[PDB]
Design a protein around this ligand. Structure first.
Ligand SMILES: Cc1ccc2c(c1[C@H](OC(C)(C)C)C(=O)O)[C@]1(CC2)CC[C@@H](C)CC1
Ligand SMILES: Cc1ccc2c(c1[C@H](OC(C)(C)C)C(=O)O)[C@]1(CC2)CC[C@@H](C)CC1
Lengths: 141, 141
């Protein structure tokens, strides 16, 4: 609901790892294939994300993702706090996997199809996710 | 001046290649270390960028960057045209290298320092580049 909240999760496809970041208020997605589920990969991704968008808090469906000192150092440097207002009651990852499968045959590498699917998701329409995120953030200013 | 214009260039540091994308109207930067100056690296970067921002035209200071069929295919799929309104009369890359040098000792890897410098650049103040780009794009809507 708030404009600075992002949710980060990893999902798996074709034996590879996809890190998926969702801007909760807009549905806008940032995703990319990473070599492994490691603290260093998560930390580097957070640093990239935080330099491109105003990231205030981060949530996840796997709390242990954020236990490594390397991730904690990346949140510390970027001024990112953990999100505590989003409960866990056991979506976009399935929508993303659906789009990836639709375009998968158009690219050789999974990482390319992932970026094609991010493009499709963020620009699909009644605004698009890419339109909503900028309107939410700009309005917050 | 127009909200869909980006300029892409590669610069070199520590024997590595930095791809730098600048949103011309705002000064907002996206940058990352890439293994080599190749058409495939440029194409993948453009696909990523185009899924995150509304990219209409792309300029560069090295026209031959955009001659590979692989880059042409990435522009074709994302609907990106070449920018023809920005002449070439022989800046941000120097500002970026300045910031990188300031933070370089705080990280082991150059790629990390680059993302730290992107963060510093985009959030430095009279708005910041990250504030201007969202205001420009949102206003365009
Ligand atoms: C390797 C490779 C070779 C050639 C082409 C592609 C690629 C993709 O890999 C890179 C993004 C790293 C260049 C891929 O994974 O096939 C295109 C078309 C032409 C790029 C644009 C895409 C929209 C379609 C796939
Ligand atoms: C390898 C490595 C190991 C440990 C730490 C870091 C790193 C950096 O590399 C990754 C971003 C890939 C994790 C680096 O290049 O040193 C930090 C602190 C702790 C991450 C946060 C940064 C703001 C400072 C450097």
């Amino acid at each position: 609901c708030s404009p600075g909240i992002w949710q980060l999760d990893c999902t798996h496809l074709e034996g590879k790892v996809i890190l998926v970041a969702v801007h909760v208020a807009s549905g806008y997605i940032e995703a990319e294939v990473i070599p492994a589920e490691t603290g260093q990969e998560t930390a580097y991704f957070l640093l990239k994300l935080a330099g491109r968008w105003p990231v205030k808090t981060v949530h996840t469906d796997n709390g242990s993702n954020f236990t490594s000192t390397t991730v904690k150092a990346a949140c510390w440097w970027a001024g990112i706090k953990q999100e505590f207002g989003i409960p866990y009651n056991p979506s976009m990852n399935k929508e993303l996997k659906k789009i990836i499968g639709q375009v998968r045959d158009q690219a050789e590498h999974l990482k390319t199809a992932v970026q094609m699917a991010v493009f499709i998701h963020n620009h699909k329409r009644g605004y698009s996710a890419g339109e909503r995120i900028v309107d939410i953030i700009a309005t917050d200013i």
